[PDB]
Amino acid sequence: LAFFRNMYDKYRDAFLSHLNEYSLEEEIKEHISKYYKLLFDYNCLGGKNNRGILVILIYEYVKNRDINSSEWEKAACLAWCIEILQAAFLVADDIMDKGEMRRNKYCWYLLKDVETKNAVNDVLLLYNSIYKLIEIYLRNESCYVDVIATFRDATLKTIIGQHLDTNIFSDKYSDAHREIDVNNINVPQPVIDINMINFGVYKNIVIHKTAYYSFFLPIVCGMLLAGIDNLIYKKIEDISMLMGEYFQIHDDYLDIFGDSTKTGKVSDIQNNKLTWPLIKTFELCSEPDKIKIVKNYGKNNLACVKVIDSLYEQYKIRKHYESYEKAQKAKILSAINELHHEGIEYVLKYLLEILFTGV
Amino acid sequence: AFFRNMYDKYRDAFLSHLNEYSLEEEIKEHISKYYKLLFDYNCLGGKNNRGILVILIYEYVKNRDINSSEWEKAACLAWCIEILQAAFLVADDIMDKGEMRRNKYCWYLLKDVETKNAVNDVLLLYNSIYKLIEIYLRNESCYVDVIATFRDATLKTIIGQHLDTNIFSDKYSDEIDVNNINVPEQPVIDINMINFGVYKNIVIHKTAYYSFFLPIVCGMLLAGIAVDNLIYKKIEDISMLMGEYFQIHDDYLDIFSDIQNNKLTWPLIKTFELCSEPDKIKIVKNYGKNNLACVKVIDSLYEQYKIRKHYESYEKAQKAKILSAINELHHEGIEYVLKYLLEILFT
Ligand SMILES: CC(C)=CCC/C(C)=C/CC/C(C)=C/CCC(C)=CCOP(=O)(O)OP(=O)(O)O
Ligand SMILES: CC(C)=CCCC(C)=CCC/C(C)=C/CC/C(C)=C/COP(=O)(O)OP(=O)(O)O
């Protein structure tokens, strides 16, 4: 954990050293290293590092065995690669959702020395840096191809979850009969589609957007590098899905019922997002309140968000979350005990306890 | 060249992969509708020089019989570079706030798309390449080397793109202010960066590697020419010369949005080396401005210093320099392709 955090610079400078080998004039090289050192530092440092720590712990507990410094160097590489992946996702998400704060600092894209134009380019650099690092440190491992495929496949699932989260209430999803007009370049007003306000659709989004890169990818990383393919991978796939759902519902809860100075970020109601509080309120509310939701949800105006916010207090959404949290935490524990692997079971139970705080 | 008929197979091969995801049937139909248009709109319509370059290099190295299955792997790599070009095109238009590309509206401008989807779509298109390389080349021995060639060429392009975006920025003039989100920096020219050395650094990284090196290395790797072969460095040097040649022509075409977008172009560097001191101040005062009078002034200086004639002089001198480097290859098959590519480049 403290070891993992200390290995950071080794991986950052290994990648910066690779760019430094490029055939460029010495002055250009120094500007590049100044820019990219800050890109990594600013966006890779500051989170709970749950995904990174999950690799390290799964690598150690897959089997009780001797692990040399060189083997740990490969494990802390994969651990930092998932943090770089989280860093790329967060920069991209903030551009896309027009974010203000992340990890108690300004969104990288808002910086006037950066802007959207560099941030778009920087998402791809951070994303490609992962595969450069896995090559530098795992080039000769037999799990190499399987590890790169795991990153590639989790990323693809996240891109699809991101697409669904962005477009679930869009005109092209509500008007399936009409093709996308490639001649219309006017601005779209976003409104909810009640046919999509259901937990079935929610799970489809949340599993793809969070479960695969936050839980499946780090666990499979630790296991592939340890040397294990086996029927346990499907069992860990199912647990990852349940943990992803659990993690995202809490993230939704935090968005409306959390302090920005504690979470590090200020938007779901204004951004017209399909959230768990929205689905819960909709199943529990009266017909006039349903129409009141449709009229005020997805609007940048503070008086419209207050209407939604007041309705969340009215239908005591915080208490329903508390009841969901206990029902799901218990459900995941049950699935973990059906694993029949004491090592992984220990890590997953520990991860489940430390999820919302980190460490 | 049956490469155009193979498009749908690679498109559907990737779409079929997404279709295997655990999603409700209605969600699957919306996804396939969206992503079929994303591929079609951005992968079809270009000259396909990069795609064709793979096919031609593959054919003229393997001077022997090539079966349908071997061509299926070659046209996969060829379409992968076209998907890469598609991902670059979409990203570039978001970044440069483009209006038109290949005689149609930029994908990000579309009402049903917007910048938010366009950012996400660049990464889908980009990752679809590696899914396709896996589907069709996972059992080839060149597999790892091919993926490494795509990764390394992309990394170089990202760096050239960074340089092209920031070469005149206040951060490149002499630390980045992580507290400034409110004071927008006005775009301005930096005369210390108006030189051919800096320009070659940008152009080689931004174009040469993915436009020439990557497609040639793809054909060669798939044909079976070993990575340890000294010819790869020779092809690297030719790719750099061809990249420079291709980009200078692209800059020439733009004028005869770069002026308004404050870009370091070959006509700007040429005009600056050839013009008087009052005209240098006139360039600094009018370049990089979204005002019609300002662009008109820069346009007139390019006409005055007959930049079109200097390009014509450059194009003849550079063409010879590459032909000379191509003849030092000692490979009749590749040499024919490179000479043919050089003739057909602009059309
Ligand atoms: C890594 C990714 C996908 C990206 C983000 C940012 C980067 C590095 C971007 C793109 C910069 C780039 C290489 C740009 C644009 C050049 C372009 C689209 C084209 C012109 O090529 P032609 O061959 O003349 O056009 P056709 O394809 O239409 O024939
Ligand atoms: C392929 C790439 C890089 C991207 C483009 C677009 C995609 C797929 C998206 C990103 C959307 C996404 C999954 C989001 C962000 C989630 C996020 C930053 C959040 C919260 O996780 P925590 O674990 O709470 O944060 P810490 O890492 O700070 O602990």
TrEMBL record, chain B:
What is one cellular component GO term in this UniProt entry? cytoplasm
Q: Name one GO molecular function term.
A: (2E,6E)-farnesyl diphosphate synthase activity
Please give one Pfam family short name: polyprenyl_synt
Task: Please name the GO terms of the biological process aspect recorded for this protein, alphabetically.
Answer: farnesyl diphosphate biosynthetic process
Question: Which residues are involved in binding Mg(2+) 3?
Answer: 250, 254, 258
Q: Where does Mg(2+) 2 bind?
A: 250
Which sequence ranges are marked TM in the entry?
Answer: 209-232
Residues that, per the record, bind Mg(2+) 1: 92, 96, 164
**Family of this protein:** Belongs to the FPP/GGPP synthase family.
Q: What is the protein's name according to its record? A: Farnesyl pyrophosphate synthase, putative
